[PDB]
């Protein structure tokens, strides 16, 4: 990578909007990835930094960038209950049916943590409700196992 | 009492002899160390959970132990760390004065009953309870120069052949091995295990069965059949002793009849218990021993005994093995004693020369030469009675008291010589009268100096214990100085001195002394004429006094505050911190570059570099390291350019160019536990189960606010580590049950392979040592290797890990901190230039009060000390001033006259402040104790002036000015003699640039500057004070 | 003076071939020749 | 120190008699102390 690529990964994670702003002006690599394959957008999505997610996507960040285990920023945002970021990523063309190495989708992760608003947004953008993981489990199979009767009704 | 001993000089001699014998005995038997025990008693609980993450360690070990640390006496606070190396360290800090043995056994007893609650793996490893100590006597490095041994090989040799013998050496307390004894390492192969349908579970099962001590019984044991002839013990299975035996451990017998041994599925060798640390000495593999001095032991005798034992181990060393001494404090302590003994001897010689310059008879010069050693020796007997040691603080405590000791000797003798010269009285009658003038004052002085120094002993915490060393040393020496002045010195004067004819001031002599006596008698008239002029216009000198008092107050506020000055001790540390996730190999490359620098660009200064990969200041891990630098002899490093400070600044500047690493050198502190003056130690606490992430957010919020106040706060950072990406793997319970695969077999296979498992013990050459099973490195490096590990199902099918597992990347803590049983995050920082520690702390409290709900805080360590130390000061200053006043009031029989003495304080303080400010030194303890001794001697000079003046007015019925002029005339010579001797006595300390010069400069500079002004101003100002006070009241 | 010791050597491979567990061998030899402290009982109100 | 003129008495099983016999022995002593009101008052067991 590069020196500024490291500072952007740190700034994006930390939630330092002003530092990200200056780094985007100076031309810090938006596609800079750490050893596990996490871009600044991965980190911003994980820690729930909405403005940085939007600024990175404006500066040509790969919305469908995946780590060394095949997980995308939408996977992270959907799993940790960041509703606004999930909407932004999906508007900027995030693959709603993105499968990691385990066959897990953003819908599976949202269903597992009982993020009802996010599950509805994924279904609104055409989330495959019948999509199975490596163990042949759907988002509905997770809801009945978790005992989330509200979520199970949405997924029908 | 002086009258009693004037008529009884043999009795006076008997007392002096008894004092010298007691002191002579004390010198031989007194303990010797660099510094005494300063820090409050602390007990550390250490446990190891092999292959455990920070949260696993915290939630199974740390929290369980913390919840059970109840019903223990005199606990101040409890703090702990749980990191990803599988290590937990809980530190329990106790009240100053607590019995450290009782503290340890109480902690240890509460742990014992909490052991059944801990994981069986942690119970197997053990949980060490030790008394926390940072101060090493010396570090013995053990290296191999011919490259025939690894660090593991050397560590095993030291543990087996050296460590125990060093632990038994005279004066040796504790010995720490920098490494471990051998462990039987079974490096498993997953391809070979799967091939024979075996797992790590089978390897552990087989080792436990085939490496064990089995109890059998006895032939013809009781109760026997009567007529039995033989009774013998039955020996069955005993532990395995070699790699060969472990390789022949039977795992499986195949259908055809072929045997699967442990050597078929694993690589077997004697290796290290763990591989986290890589130690190198100038690039070569190294182990070592960290040796601590035993309680009440002699550092110099112990270091000599350690080297004597290592010397007779030399012949039995393997080829290439060499002993090196990267750290040893005794050469520094050797110099400290020599330089202090030198100062005391030179001081006695300087007094002899001054005594002869003025009095000009060899009989007079003998009385101080006898008296001062008698006081010094007596002081040692009193230190021994108090249970003190010969250490840096107590040694410099006696150097600072030289001025007071010397004055007692001069004042008594000089006053007899004058009385004989002025009246023509014979020595004995002259001595009786001379003592009659001063004996009441000398006692008054003893009480005034007691009032000054004794309260300094009653400060709490670390700094209080340091001040207590100087306090008892000075008070003891001062107390014995006055007893010797009231008993021995008068008896010596009366019996040894030669009579002087009335009016003989030596003006009729020829040569140097004829000239000098005429010069000084003329100078005394110039002085009294000058005081006469001053006392006609006191108003303008009262104004000049307020300029001095204001100038003093101004310089006090401006002078930067410190604890103890940093010394060139022939060593300094270099920190190496790489970013998160950085491997052991990457850290070694930075360390190799750091070492290569010191041996190339500082080859004339540096002797060796001790590079330790896997250990930082506070943290551990693969991305942390430290390079302990050892310098050549002080003599080979001339000038400031080749000193630790110059080298430090040179190295730190050179290493700022290094990429993907934070590297810098720095000098060791005098005492590590003090920290930094202006430095604070802050704890941010989770008070309502908010969790790790929310306390992190609250920390970031506080750190950001602290950054907006650079005028008040500087370098406000976390002491801990940041969250790192960690490999979360979920076992599918349904899939495991569906395939007939047990979860115990899964978690054992994963844990044993990737983390390592301590199975049981074996006996290597008559020494019990551990057996570890772990994956051969190459099969436990990357996530793809997870699938290569197979677990046997109930039906006999080998199932890969991928079939029943799913993984993802997440962030978690590699080091979780707790404070008083609650989740915490330690924040270090310091007050900005010009700002006090107190102001910086008050802002941090103000910033802390604006943090989210359920986020509290607390002050720990030096900050906890600083608060409880600062709350006492006002009371201890008040008591000192009040008792000084009351003592002077009893002496002079006056509520007003005492003010004329107490007004002298600033005259000595301004000179100390000017000298310290000019030379660019700090307000350290040596300077502060220097002020009290400077204030003490000037106060004594004023007391004798005011006593002589008051007595002249009372007895001879003289006027205020007449008495004042006649007093200061009589007191001029003795004041100049003491000042001339003492200022020359501390001149070597000021100009010193050698080893231990930092402390010598701090003691010398402030005292010399203070004495110059105290002497010059007081002789002119004490006359003014007395007249002004007497006129007013 | 040094005492004579009766060293018995259990062939675990032969024991495994005959389908005999090592724990049963160790206990049988141990309990018989050495005596095995199993558990406690109450003799006239006292634990023994 | 205790109440003005209270006493704290212990009845001991010295010969492995058992709980039942010690209860009977206690009941016997309580019944004996019951018909000495002139000397003893409120002699009772401190147990269940
Ligand atoms: C009333 C009569 C009494 C009898 C004594 C008379 C005293 C004066 C004369 C003494 C004879 C010797 O004379 C003496 O010589 C020595 C050596 O050069 C001088 O030496 C001394 O004074 C000079 C200055 O003059 C200093 O720089 C020098 O440090 C000091 O040693 C004396 O100043 C002088 O007084
Ligand atoms: C800041 C550093 C400097 C501070 C040092 C202060 C103390 C050391 C300096 C000593 C000076 C004393 O020197 C002395 O001064 C006084 C001034 O009142 C002079 O006194 C003069 O003025 C007074 C008052 O009008 C007259 O009564 C007197 O007849 C006249 O001689 C003395 O002739 C002189 O000998
Ligand atoms: C930090 N310290 C003083 C040093 C310096 C140089 C070294 O070369 C070493 C240490 C620490 C010691 C601690 C010991 C410890 N023990 C006394 C066996 C120990 O249990 C561990 C451990 N991580 O559990 C080690 O790393 C250790 O084996 C080790 O490898 C060390 C080591 O090699
Ligand atoms: C003659 C009267 C002297 C009064 C001064 C006595 C001071 C003693 C205070 C004490 O007990 O603590 C010593 C303390 C330990 O931290 O050491 C010190 O801080 C040195 C004190 C130097 C300044 C004294 C005040 C003069 C300013 C006008
Ligand atoms: C004869 C001289 C020796 C006298 C010294 C004794 C002084 C003892 C110090 C007592 C400490 C008092 C602390 C009070 C702190 C309360 C805070 C409000
Ligand atoms: C610690 C300082 C205490 C000072 C106490 C005040 C003393 C006042 C002096 C009065 C003198 C009375 C003169 C005779 C009338
Ligand atoms: C802290 C309590 C003691 C303070 C010191 C007392 C000083 C007493 C001074 C009395 C002056 C009396 C003047 C008489 C006119
Ligand atoms: C108790 C405070 C210390 C005061 C000491 C003063 C002693 C004065 C004795 C005078 N004398 C009786 C000898 O003449
Ligand atoms: C070798 C131990 C005896 C000598 C120690 C030095 C004592 C001097 C203190 C001033
Ligand atoms: C006006 C200056 C006079 C100086 C007199 C001081 C003499 C002191 C010599 C010891
Ligand atoms: C007046 C007798 C004093 C001597 C006692 C040490
Ligand atoms: C230092 C311990 C012994 C002291 C003798 C009174
Ligand atoms: Cl948590």
Is B214 near chain C, with CB under 8 Å? yes
**Contact between C44 and D13 using a beta-carbon 8 Å cutoff:** no
Q: Minimum-distance ligand to the CA of B888?
A: 8
Q: Is the CB of B369 under 6 A from ligand 4?
A: no
Is C45 near chain D, with CB under 8 Å? yes
CA distance B781 to chain A (A): 13
Is C30 near chain B, with CB under 8 Å? yes
Q: Quick check: B568 and B582 in contact, CB under 8 A?
A: no
Q: Are strands B713-718 and B679-686 parallel, antiparallel or unpaired?
A: unpaired
Task: Report the C-alpha gap between B1026 and A95 in whole angstroms.
Answer: 95
Q: Are strands B790-792 and B250-253 parallel, antiparallel or unpaired?
A: unpaired
Test mutation, B211, B212, B214, chain C, max C CBs within 10 A: B214
Reading the block at residue B611, the tokens are 């590079």
Distance from CA of residue B290 to its chain's centroid?
16
Closest-CA residue to B434 (of B420, B418, B416): B416
Distances (CA, A) of B606 to B334, B602, B637, B655, B895: 22, 6, 10, 16, 64
**Contact between B809 and A71 using a beta-carbon 8 Å cutoff:** yes
Residue nearest to atom 9 of ligand 10 (CA): B523
CA distance C15 to chain B (A): 12
Test mutation, C14, C32, C33, chain B, max B CBs within 10 A: C33
**Contact between C33 and B233 using a beta-carbon 8 Å cutoff:** no
**Contact between C30 and B250 using a beta-carbon 8 Å cutoff:** no
Domain spans, chain A: 1-156
Closest-CA residue to A43 (of A12, A71, A69, A21): A12
Is D21 near chain C, with CB under 8 Å? no
Distance from the alpha carbon of residue B445 to the mean position of ligand 6, in angstroms:
20
Residue nearest to atom 3 of ligand 5 (CA): B451
Looking at B424-509, list the stretches that DSSP marks H as alpha helix, in order from N- to C-terminal side.
Answer: 427-453, 461-496
Name the CA radius of gyration of chain A, rounded: 16
Phi, psi of B287 (to 5 degrees): -110, -160
Q: Quick check: B267 and B127 in contact, CB under 8 A?
A: no
Residues, beta carbon < 5 Å, ion ligand 13: B 691-692
Q: Quick check: B246 and B211 in contact, CB under 8 A?
A: yes
Name the CA radius of gyration of chain B, rounded: 36
- Contacts for B886-891: CB closer than 8 Å, 24+ residues apart: B887/B444, B887/B447, B887/B448, B887/B451, B888/B444, B888/B448, B888/B943, B890/B444, B891/B440, B891/B441, B891/B444, B891/B943, B891/B947
Ligand 8 pocket, mutate which of B434, B436, B438, B443 (most atoms under 8 A from CB): B443
Phi, psi of B890 (to 5 degrees): -65, -45
Write out the H or E segment, with its range, that includes residue B326.
strand B321-328
Chains that touch A (3 or more CB pairs under 8 A): B
Residue nearest to atom 7 of ligand 9 (CA): B27
**Contact between B806 and A46 using a beta-carbon 8 Å cutoff:** no
Q: Quick check: A118 and A110 in contact, CB under 8 A?
A: yes
Q: Enumerate the β-bridge partners of residue B267.
A: B187
Q: Quick check: A62 and A72 in contact, CB under 8 A?
A: no
Which runs of E-coded beta strand occur in B849-967? 855-859
Q: Is the CB of B362 under 6 A from ligand 11?
A: no
Write out the H or E segment, with its range, that includes residue A149.
helix A149-154
Resolution of the determined structure in angstroms stands at: 2.3
Distances (CA, A) of B395 to B334, B474, B794, B851: 12, 10, 76, 49
Distance from the alpha carbon of residue B932 to the mean position of ligand 4, in angstroms:
6
Reading the block at residue B276, the tokens are 């986290």
Distances (CA, A) of B452 to A85, B447, B877, B935: 69, 9, 9, 9
Ligand 5 pocket, mutate which of B479, B879, B889 (most atoms under 8 A from CB): B879
Q: Provide, as residue numbers in chain D, all residues whose Cβ is less than 8 Å from the Cβ of C41.
A: none
Is C39 near chain B, with CB under 8 Å? no
Question: Could you tell me how many CB contacts below 8 A there are between chain C and chain D?
Answer: 6
What's the distance, Cα to Cα, between the start and end of chain C in Å? 36
Closest-CA residue to B847 (of B693, B691, B701): B701
Q: What is the largest CA-CA distance in chain D?
A: 35
Phi, psi of B658 (to 5 degrees): -65, 135
Q: Is the peptide bond preceding residue B223 cis, with omega within 30 degrees of 0?
A: yes
Closest-CA residue to B973 (of B1004, B944, B949, B1010): B944
With CA atoms as reference, the chain D residue closest to C43 would be D16
Q: Quick check: B84 and B619 in contact, CB under 8 A?
A: no
For domain B184-272, give the CATH number. 3.30.2090.10
Q: Quick check: B293 and B33 in contact, CB under 8 A?
A: yes
**What number does the ligand 7 atom closest to the CA of B885 have?**
5
DSSP type of residue B579:
P
Chains that touch D (3 or more CB pairs under 8 A): C
Burial (0-12, 13-18, 19+ Cβ within 10 Å), B316? exposed
**Contact between C46 and D18 using a beta-carbon 8 Å cutoff:** no
Is C45 near chain B, with CB under 8 Å? no
Is B250 near chain C, with CB under 8 Å? yes
Q: Is the CB of B311 under 6 A from ligand 7?
A: no
- Contacts for B257-265: CB closer than 8 Å, 24+ residues apart: B259/C13, B260/B196, B260/B198, B262/B186, B262/B203, B262/B206, B262/B207, B264/B192, B264/B196, B265/B188, B265/B189, B265/B192, B265/B193, B265/B196, B265/B198, B265/B203
In chain A, DSSP finds a helix count (H) and a strand count (E) of 10, 0
Residue with tokens 């001595």: B431
CA distance C42 to chain B (A): 23
Task: Report the C-alpha gap between B180 and B178 in whole angstroms.
Answer: 7
Phi, psi of B918 (to 5 degrees): -60, -50
What's the distance, Cα to Cα, between the start and end of chain B in Å? 34
Residue nearest to atom 16 of ligand 5 (CA): B872
- Domain B724-816, CATH among 3.30.930.10, 3.30.2090.10, 3.40.50.2000, 1.10.1740.10: 3.30.2090.10
Q: Quick check: B778 and B832 in contact, CB under 8 A?
A: no
Q: Provide, as residue numbers in chain A, all residues whose Cβ is less than 8 Å from the Cβ of B581.
A: 34-36
Q: Are strands B259-261 and B250-253 parallel, antiparallel or unpaired?
A: antiparallel
Burial (0-12, 13-18, 19+ Cβ within 10 Å), B712? buried
Task: Report the C-alpha gap between B594 and B578 in whole angstroms.
Answer: 13
Is C3 near chain B, with CB under 8 Å? yes
CA distance D36 to chain C (A): 33
CA distance C36 to chain D (A): 27
Count of Cβ atoms closer than 10 Å to residue B688 Cβ: 12
- HSE, CB side, 13 Å, CA atoms: give it for residue B253: 9
Q: Is the CB of B884 under 6 A from ligand 4?
A: yes
With CA atoms as reference, the chain C residue closest to B248 would be C13
Q: Provide, as residue numbers in chain D, all residues whose Cβ is less than 8 Å from the Cβ of C44.
A: 16
C near A: at least 3 beta-carbon pairs less than 8 Å apart: no
- HSE, CB side, 13 Å, CA atoms: give it for residue B116: 2
Residue nearest to atom 10 of ligand 8 (CA): B440
Distance from the alpha carbon of residue B355 to the mean position of ligand 1, in angstroms:
21
Across the interface, of B209, B219, B230, the residue whose CB is closest to C22 is B209
Q: Provide, as residue numbers in chain C, all residues whose Cβ is less than 8 Å from the Cβ of B221.
A: 33-35
Contacts of B653 (CB under 8 A, 6+ apart): none
Count of Cβ atoms closer than 10 Å to residue B970 Cβ: 20
Ligand 12 pocket, mutate which of B384, B386, B389, B391 (most atoms under 8 A from CB): B384
């Amino acid at each position: 990578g590069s020196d500024l690529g490291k500072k952007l990964l740190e700034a994006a994670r930390a939630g330092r909007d002003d530092e990200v702003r200056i780094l985007m002006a100076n031309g810090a690599d938006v596609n800079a990835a750490d050893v596990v394959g996490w871009t600044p957008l991965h980190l911003a999505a994980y820690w729930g930094h909405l403005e940085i997610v939007e600024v990175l996507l404006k500066n040509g960040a790969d919305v469908n960038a995946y780590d060394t285990l095949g997980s995308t920023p939408l996977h992270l945002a959907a799993h940790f209950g960041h509703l606004e970021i999930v909407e932004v990523l999906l508007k900027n063309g995030a693959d709603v049916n993105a499968k990691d190495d385990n066959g897990i989708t953003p819908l599976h992760l949202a269903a597992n943590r009982g993020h009802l608003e996010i599950v509805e947004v994924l279904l609104k953008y055409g989330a495959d409700v019948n999509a199975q993981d490596k163990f042949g489990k759907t988002a509905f199979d997770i809801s009945i196992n978790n005992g989330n009767e509200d979520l199970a009704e949405i997924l029908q | 009492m002086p009258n009693f001993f004037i008529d009884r000089p043999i009795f006076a001699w008997v007392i002096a002899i008894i004092i010298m014998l007691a002191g002579g005995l004390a010198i031989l038997k007194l303990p010797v160390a660099q510094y005494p025990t300063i820090a409050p008693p602390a007990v550390t609980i250490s446990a190891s959970y092999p292959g455990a993450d920070a949260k696993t360690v915290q939630d199974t070990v740390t929290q369980v132990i913390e919840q059970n640390m109840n019903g223990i006496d005199n606990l101040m606070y409890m703090s702990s760390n749980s990191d990803s190396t599988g290590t937990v360290q809980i530190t329990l800090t106790f009240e100053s004065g607590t019995d450290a043995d009782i503290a340890q056994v109480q902690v240890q007893n509460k742990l014992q009953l909490a052991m059944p609650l801990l994981p069986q793996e942690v119970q197997q490893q053990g949980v060490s309870v030790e008394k926390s100590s940072s101060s090493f006597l010396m570090v013995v490095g053990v290296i191999n120069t011919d490259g025939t041994m690894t660090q593991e090989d050397i560590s095993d040799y030291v543990a087996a052949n050296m460590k125990d013998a060093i632990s038994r050496t005279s004066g040796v307390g504790d010995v720490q091995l920098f490494g471990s004894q051998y462990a039987m390492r079974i490096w498993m192969n997953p391809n070979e295990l799967n091939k024979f349908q075996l797992t790590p579970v089978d390897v552990i099962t087989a080792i436990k069965a085939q490496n064990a001590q089995v109890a059998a019984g006895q032939l013809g044991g009781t109760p026997p059949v009567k007529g039995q002839q033989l009774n013998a013990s039955i020996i069955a299975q005993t532990r395995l002793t070699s790699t060969e035996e472990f390789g022949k451990i039977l795992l499986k017998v195949n259908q055809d009849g072929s045997r699967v041994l442990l050597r078929d599925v694993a690589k077997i060798e004697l290796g290290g218990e763990n591989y986290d640390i890589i130690a190198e000495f100038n690039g070569q593999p190294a182990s070592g021993l960290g040796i601590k001095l035993a309680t009440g032991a002699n550092a110099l005798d112990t270091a000599a005994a350690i080297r004597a034992e290592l010397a007779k181990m030399e012949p039995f060393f393997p080829s290439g093995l060499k002993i090196v001494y990267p750290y040893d404090t005794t050469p520094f302590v050797k110099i400290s004693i020599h330089e202090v003994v030198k100062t005391l001897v030179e001081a006695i010689i300087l007094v002899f020369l001054v005594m002869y310059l003025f009095l000009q008879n060899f009989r007079a010069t003998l009385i101080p030469t006898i008296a001062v050693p008698v006081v010094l020796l007596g002081t040692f007997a009193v230190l021994a009675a108090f249970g003190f040691s010969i250490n840096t603080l107590t040694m410099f405590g006696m150097v600072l008291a030289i001025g007071l000791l010397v004055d007692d000797a001069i004042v008594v003798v000089e006053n007899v010589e004058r009385v004989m010269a002025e009246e023509g009285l014979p020595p004995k009658e002259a001595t009786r009268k001379s003592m009659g003038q001063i004996q009441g004052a000398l006692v008054g002085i003893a009480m005034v100096l007691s009032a000054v120094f004794v309260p300094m002993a009653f400060f709490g915490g670390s700094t209080g214990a340091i001040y207590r060393q100087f306090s008892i040393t000075i008070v003891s020496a001062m107390a014995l100085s006055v007893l010797v002045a009231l008993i021995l010195t008068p008896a010596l004067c009366a019996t040894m001195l030669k009579p002087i004819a009335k009016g003989d001031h030596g003006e009729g002599k020829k040569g140097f002394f004829g000239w000098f006596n005429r010069m000084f008698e003329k100078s005394t008239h110039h002085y009294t004429d000058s005081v006469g002029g001053i006392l006609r216009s006191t108003g303008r000198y009262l104004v000049l006094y307020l300029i001095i008092v204001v100038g003093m107050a101004y310089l006090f506020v401006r002078l930067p505050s410190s604890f103890l000055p940093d010394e060139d001790q022939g060593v300094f540390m270099t920190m190496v911190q790489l970013p998160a996730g950085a491997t052991q190999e990457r850290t070694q490359k930075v360390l190799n570059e750091v070492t290569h620098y010191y041996l190339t660009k500082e080859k004339n200064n540096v002797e060796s570099v001790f590079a330790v990969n896997g250990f930082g200041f506070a943290p551990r891990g693969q991305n942390t390291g430290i390079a302990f630098v050892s310098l050549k002899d002080w003599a080979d490093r001339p000038g400031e350019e080749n000193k630790v400070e110059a080298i430090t600044m040179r190295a730190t500047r050179a290493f700022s160019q290094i990429k993907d690493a934070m590297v810098f050198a720095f000098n060791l502190p005098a005492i590590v536990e003090l920290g930094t003056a202006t430095g604070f130690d802050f704890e941010l606490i989770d008070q309502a189960g908010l969790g790790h992430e929310k306390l992190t957010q609250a920390r970031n919020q506080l750190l950001a606010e602290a950054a907006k106040h650079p005028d008040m706060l500087t370098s406000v950072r976390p002491n801990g580590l940041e969250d790192t990406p960690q490999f979360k793997i979920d076992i599918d319970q349904e899939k495991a049950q569906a395939l007939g695969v047990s979860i115990n077999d899964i978690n054992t296979t994963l844990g044993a392979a990737w983390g390592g498992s301590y199975v049981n013990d074996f006996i290597d050459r008559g020494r019990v040592k551990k057996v570890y099973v772990m994956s051969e490195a190459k099969y436990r490096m990357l996530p793809d290797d997870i699938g290569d590990w197979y677990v046997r199902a109930a039906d006999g099918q080998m199932v890969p890990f991928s079939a029943f597992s799913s993984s993802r990347w997440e962030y978690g803590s590699p080091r979780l901190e707790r404070y008083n049983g609650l989740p915490s995050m330690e924040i270090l920082g310091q007050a900005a230039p010009g700002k006090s520690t107190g102001e910086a702390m008050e802002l941090m409290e103000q910033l802390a009060s604006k943090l989210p709900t359920g986020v509290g805080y607390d002050w720990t360590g030096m900050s906890y000390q600083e608060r409880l130390s600062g709350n006492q000061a006002p009371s201890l200053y008040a008591i000192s001033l009040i008792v000084v006043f009351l003592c002077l009031a009893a002496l002079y029989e006056s509520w007003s006259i005492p003010f004329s003495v107490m007004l002298v304080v600033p005259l000595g303080v301004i000179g100390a402040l000017l000298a310290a400010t000019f030379r660019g030194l700090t307000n350290d303890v040596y300077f502060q104790v220097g002020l009290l001794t400077t204030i003490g001697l000037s106060a004594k000079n004023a007391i004798l002036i005011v006593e002589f003046a008051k007595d002249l007015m009372d007895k001879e019925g003289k006027g205020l000015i007449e008495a004042t002029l006649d007093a200061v005339r009589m007191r001029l010579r003795p004041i100049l003699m003491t000042s001339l001797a003492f200022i020359l006595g501390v001149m070597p300390l000021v100009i010193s640039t050698g080893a231990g010069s930092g402390a010598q400069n701090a003691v010398g500079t402030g005292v010399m500057g203070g004495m110059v002004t105290a002497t010059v101003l007081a002789i002119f100002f004490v006359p003014v004070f007395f007249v002004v006070v007497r006129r007013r009241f």
